[PDB]
Amino acid sequence: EWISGTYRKMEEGPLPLLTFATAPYHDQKPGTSGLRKKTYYFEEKPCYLENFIQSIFFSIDLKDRQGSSLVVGGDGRYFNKSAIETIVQMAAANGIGRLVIGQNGILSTPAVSCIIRKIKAIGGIILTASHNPGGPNGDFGIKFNISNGGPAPEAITDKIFQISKTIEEYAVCPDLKVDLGVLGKQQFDLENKFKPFTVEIVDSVEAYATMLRSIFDFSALKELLSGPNRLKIRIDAMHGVVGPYVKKILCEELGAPANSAVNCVPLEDFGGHHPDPNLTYAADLVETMKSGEHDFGAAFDGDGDRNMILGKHGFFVNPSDSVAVIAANIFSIPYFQQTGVRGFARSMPTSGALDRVASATKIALYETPTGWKFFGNLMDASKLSLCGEESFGTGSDHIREKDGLWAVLAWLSILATRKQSVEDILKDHWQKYGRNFFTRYDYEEVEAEGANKMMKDLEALMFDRSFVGKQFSVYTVEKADNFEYSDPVDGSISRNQGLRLIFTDGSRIVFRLSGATIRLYIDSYEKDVAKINQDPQVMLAPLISIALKVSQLQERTGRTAPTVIT
Ligand SMILES: O=P(O)(O)OC[C@H]1O[C@H](O)[C@H](O)[C@@H](O)[C@@H]1O
Ligand SMILES: [Zn+2]
């Protein structure tokens, strides 16, 4: 009862804010996707969570921290609610004015970016480990986003690591109890303070759904998905965070039947499976697609910034192609009608399918390294409209994070506009722009020094001029290098971003490391319409054999088959 909680709050009196001593850890360096460790790091190690959170607060200036608003939310994995409560008490003791938290701690990463930008927050804390499994024996992470809605840049994370390495005390309001399940405002009387502390529990879906309603034509979506002659879709949230979004948006508001969603209840362990959308970890989805009923399938990851796009009977549209089709039919979306195409971008290991659409029009295309920093740098400079990564990433400049459900609704808008099947659209695209046959082999969790030695010896073997011009079977080595990127907005230089083997026919073999994990990307272009409709595994097989033979991956890793194939 709300009245009982109010009376309790009144009788307890003001809540003291207290300083507690702590000892610093040494591995709290937040990388590209924040700080991710095993769950027991945050659940069992003393003050680990408090140390990192307090470091995040200290990385914010005091004038930026006093009275400001901070968004807090996560993907609903195990231990998220407890950590969120700790964040609420610490934030109460650290001068934060207001915390906007999604109901029950549920808030997808794109929803966090959107809310941050909407309410003019100083930033947000996202409790997610992305596609990594959850549970007491799973993983756990913390991302910090700044006032532009995007991930904190390297300077902020550097300050967080440096602060966390020497921190000796933190502040907390240990008697603050907050109910995450009831929407509305909860205020707390703080001791020795005159303003109360505010916690606003908002609907996890409302603001994000309003944003998408502004992005797309929900009338066309409604006519496409809700009719008796509806387009049969099957959306697999993988027990992740997009489930509630899938129902409130696709099912309720747009009229798709409730049978269209599956694995759409957020589970604290993601139902035992890895919340990673690909052909391996989402095999159940692709095998129900193999049956016959549905024309469109899609899968999401843990925090909702990734998507897998499937056609009828299991037809697979690889992400490198997905972003290119979206770019080729980009004006089927009202948002880009209002916006215009400011630029295209893709990560280097992503196939050059988008490049063909960029060159067909006259739109600048930026080949960035793996990561968000470069995409956000281009977006803030009004030079990037649509971007995509082979790691099942697709997004626009509407927010400062990638967005899986947004990409799905974009594919539904393109299907509604073109009135064709997914496979037919992909075939027409291949016949218009040529096909970029693409594959990626994931060799997960190998011995570290063996992989590093493979990359060093392979690198030295590549840099020799005895390598350039050698004919492999037939292909001819044109260039081999270690990818370097010069950022066109802040002059930053990123080196060692992937070993590249570019051939004279435009094909590429790329090696990268994510410990550790070996990632092998193969991209070969075909312009003849007679050859663009063959099994890519069969078309790329010579280049795969060249990659394994030149790298000697088997003889140094002992692996005879990749863990995942894309
Ligand atoms: O291959 P990795 O180093 O593990 O990075 C793979 C992916 O990690 C994150 O999800 C980033 O948001 C992506 O930009 C990146 O493609
Ligand atoms: Zn993710």
Question: Counting every residue, how long is the chain?
Answer: 566
Tokens (6 digits) for 138:
């799973």
Q: Is 516 in the pocket of ligand 1 (CB under 6 A)?
A: no
Q: How many helices (H) and strands (E) does the chain have?
A: 21, 27
Angle between helix axes 80-93 and 48-59 (nearest 10 degrees) is 50
Q: Is 370 annotated as a binding residue?
A: yes
Is residue 408 a contact partner of residue 309, using CB atoms and an 8 Å limit? yes
449 is in an annotated binding site: no
Residue type (1 letter), 314 = G
Structure method: X-ray
| Nearest CA owner, ligand 1 atom 1 | 514
* Ligand 1 centroid, distance to 240 Cα (angstroms): 19
DSSP 189: P
Phi, psi of 17 (to 5 degrees): -105, 130
Distance (Å, whole) CA 566 – CA 245: 27
42: CB partners within 8 A, 6+ apart: 48, 49, 79, 83, 140, 142
- DSSP annotation string for 43-104: HTSTTHHHHHHHHHHHHS-HHHHTT-EEEEEE---TTHHHHHHHHHHHHHHTT--EEEEEEE
The answer to whether 391 and 306 are in contact (CB under 8 A) is: yes
The percent helix, strand, coil of the chain (3-state, each to 5) is 40, 25, 40
Coil/strand/helix, residue 312: helix
Any idea which residues carry the catalytic annotation?
130
Cross-strand partners of 86: none
Q: Alpha-carbon distance 385 to 394, whole Å?
A: 11
Atom index in ligand 1 nearest the CA of residue 375 equals 14
Angstrom distance (rounded) from CA 169 to CA 22: 5
The reply to whether ligand 1 has any atom less than 6 angstroms from the CB of 514 is yes
402 is in an annotated binding site: yes
CA nearest 175: which of 376, 15, 2?
15
DSSP string, 356-384: HHHHHTT--EEEEPSSSHHHHHHHHTT--
Return the amino acid letter for 302. Answer: G
Q: Two tokens at 383?
A: 């030079």
CB-based contacts of 235: which residues, under 8 Å, 6+ apart? 246, 250, 260, 261, 262, 264, 297, 298, 299, 300, 408
Is 492 among the annotated ligand-binding positions?
no
Q: Cα–Cα distance between 407 and 315 in angstroms, integer?
A: 17
Q: What is the rounded CA–CA span in Å between residue 438 and residue 33?
A: 25
Q: How far is the CA of 412 from the centre of ligand 1 (A)?
A: 26
How far, in Å, is the centroid of ligand 2 from the Cα of 474? 39
Q: Burial of 277 by CB count in 10 Å (0-12 exposed, 13-18 middle, 19+ buried)?
A: buried
Is 390's C-beta closer than 6 angstroms to any atom of ligand 1? no
- Which residue among 301, 387, 391 has the greatest number of ligand 1 atoms within 8 angstroms of its CB, and so is best to mutate? 391
Q: Is the Cβ–Cβ distance between 107 and 73 less than 8 Å?
A: yes
* Complete DSSP assignment for 436-461: EEEEEEEE-S--HHHHHHHHHHHHHH
Residues, CB within 5 angstroms of ligand 2 (ion): 130, 301, 303, 305-306
Backbone angles phi, psi at 386, to 5 degrees: -130, 135
Q: 391 CB less than 6 Å from ligand 1?
A: yes
| H or E element that contains 17 | none
10 Å CB burial of residue 196 (0-12, 13-18, 19+) is middle
- Give CA torsion, residues 379, 382, 386, 388, to 10 deg: -30
Q: How many other C-beta atoms lie within 10 A of the C-beta of residue 2?
A: 10
> Phi and psi at residue 128, in whole multiples of 5°?
-155, 155
Determine which helix (DSSP H) or strand (DSSP E) holds 346, and give its type and residue range: strand 344-347
Distance CA 90, CA 220 (A): 46
Cα separations (Å) of 368 from 166, 278, 373? 34, 23, 9
Q: How many CB atoms lie within 10 A of CB 108?
A: 34
Resolution in A: 2.7
DSSP classification of residue 390: T
Find out whether the beta carbon of 69 lies less than 6 Å from any atom of ligand 1.
Answer: no
Instruction: Name which of 373, 319, 399 is nearest 497 in CA terms.
Output: 373
**Closest by alpha carbon to 235, among 296, 147, 162, 165?**
296
* Residue 372 CB less than 6 A away from ligand 1: yes
CA of 371 to the centre of ligand 1 (A): 6
**DSSP 3-state assignment of 192?**
coil
Angstrom distances, CA of residue 486 to CA of 12, 17, 151, 152:
58, 47, 20, 20
Whole-angstrom Cα distance, residue 110 to residue 119? 14
Q: Rounded to the nearest 10 degrees, what angle do helices 404-418 and 109-119 cross at?
A: 100
36 marked as binding residue:
yes
Q: Which of 519, 521, 528 is nearest to 502 (CA)?
A: 521
Which residue has 């989805």 as its token pair?
Answer: 285
